[PDB]
Amino acid sequence: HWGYGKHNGPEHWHKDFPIAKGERQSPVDIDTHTAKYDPSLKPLSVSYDQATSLRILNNGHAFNVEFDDSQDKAVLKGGPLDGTYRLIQFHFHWGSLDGQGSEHTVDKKKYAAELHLVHWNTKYGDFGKAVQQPDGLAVLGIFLKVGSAKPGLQKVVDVLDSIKTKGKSADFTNFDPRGLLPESLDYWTYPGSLTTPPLLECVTWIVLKEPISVSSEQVLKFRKLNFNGEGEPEELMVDNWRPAQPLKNRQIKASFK
Numbered sequence: 001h002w003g004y005g006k007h008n009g010p011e012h013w014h015k016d017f018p019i020a021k022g023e024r025q026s027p028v029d030i031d032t033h034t035a036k037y038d039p040s041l042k043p044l045s046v047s048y049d050q051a052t053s054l055r056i057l058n059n060g061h062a063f064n065v066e067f068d069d070s071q072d073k074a075v076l077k078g079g080p081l082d083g084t085y086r087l088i089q090f091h092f093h094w095g096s097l098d099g100q101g102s103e104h105t106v107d108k109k110k111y112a113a114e115l116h117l118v119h120w121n122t123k124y125g126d127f128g129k130a131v132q133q134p135d136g137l138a139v140l141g142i143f144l145k146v147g148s149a150k151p152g153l154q155k156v157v158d159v160l161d162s163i164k165t166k167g168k169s170a171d172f173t174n175f176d177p178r179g180l181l182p183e184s185l186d187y188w189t190y191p192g193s194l195t196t197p198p199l200l201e202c203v204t205w206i207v208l209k210e211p212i213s214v215s216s217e218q219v220l221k222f223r224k225l226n227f228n229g230e231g232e233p234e235e236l237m238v239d240n241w242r243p244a245q246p247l248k249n250r251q252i253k254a255s256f257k
């Protein structure tokens with residue numbers, strides 16, 4: 001199955017997922033000088049006050065914090081988006097070392113990790129139908145650098161020892177994703193794809209310019225997770241990021257002048 005190792009990693013994915021070589025793949029390098037301010041972007045609205053987290057799952061690639069998406073409890077609107085996008089899950093990508101781990105890069109800079117808050121367009125009824133549409137998903141991406149601890153991340157960090165291996169899950173109710181945001185909502189946006197198989201070209205990417213700071217101790221606990229299942233030889237869950245893909249016939253727009 002696909003993964004991140006030498007024998008099943010990003011350079012192999014195209015054999016089972018030929019869209020890996022498609023026209024709007026993610027992530028990309030964000031060339032900040034080329035990105036253009038877009039006055040047509042409306043104000044971005046992150047409305048997470050009524051979010052209902054449910055569970056945290058190690059899926060063998062990352063860990064997902066899952067939300068109740070059976071109604072508009074936590075939504076993203078505005079910016080480049082037409083209509084309402086409902087939060088379904090968040091997860092991270094991270095490195096073996098602080099010098100790599102992000103999927104998007106900024107003028108080729110790699111951050112230590114990247115948070116993805118995944119939302120689906122409610123006009124399509126369900127996530128599964130949304131991923132058949134060219135505007136089905138919106139992913140809010142947030143870079144992580146290593147410095148001061150992020151207090152709103154600590155609850156996530158502290159549950160990871162209970163989901164060490166692939167297929168383990170734990171209750172994760174009453175988690176507030178607002179504690180993962182930076183101060184500024186300045187962003188870059190472009191049309192792209194899922195960054196993991198099936199690599200579907202459904203995503204409006206919204207990548208915040210301001211990183212959040214997390215402590216070394218916090219990211220070190222991400223790196224204690226395992227890709228493998230219980231009882232199998234330990235393979236640390238590190239370097240679960242896809243590198244930047246060709247921009248092709250796309251422009252990155254900036255929300256800020």
Ligand SMILES: CCOc1ccc(S(N)(=O)=O)cc1
Pocket residue numbers: 116118139193194195196197198
């Ligand atoms: C069912 C797969 O759902 C996904 C896969 C990848 C992403 S990401 N890494 O592009 O945010 C989101 C949802």
Ligand SMILES: OC[C@H]1O[C@@H](O)[C@H](O)[C@@H](O)[C@@H]1O
Pocket residue numbers: 036251
């Ligand atoms: O033709 C001019 C237009 O070119 C496009 O590629 C840019 O996105 C627009 O901002 C610009 O106004």
Ligand SMILES: OC[C@H]1O[C@H](O)[C@H](O)[C@@H](O)[C@@H]1O
Pocket residue numbers: 155159171172173174175176
């Ligand atoms: O908010 C997410 C989780 O944080 C901590 O683990 C709490 O002990 C738990 O009750 C809660 O589900």
Ligand SMILES: [Zn+2]
Pocket residue numbers: 091092093116195
């Ligand atoms: Zn992701």
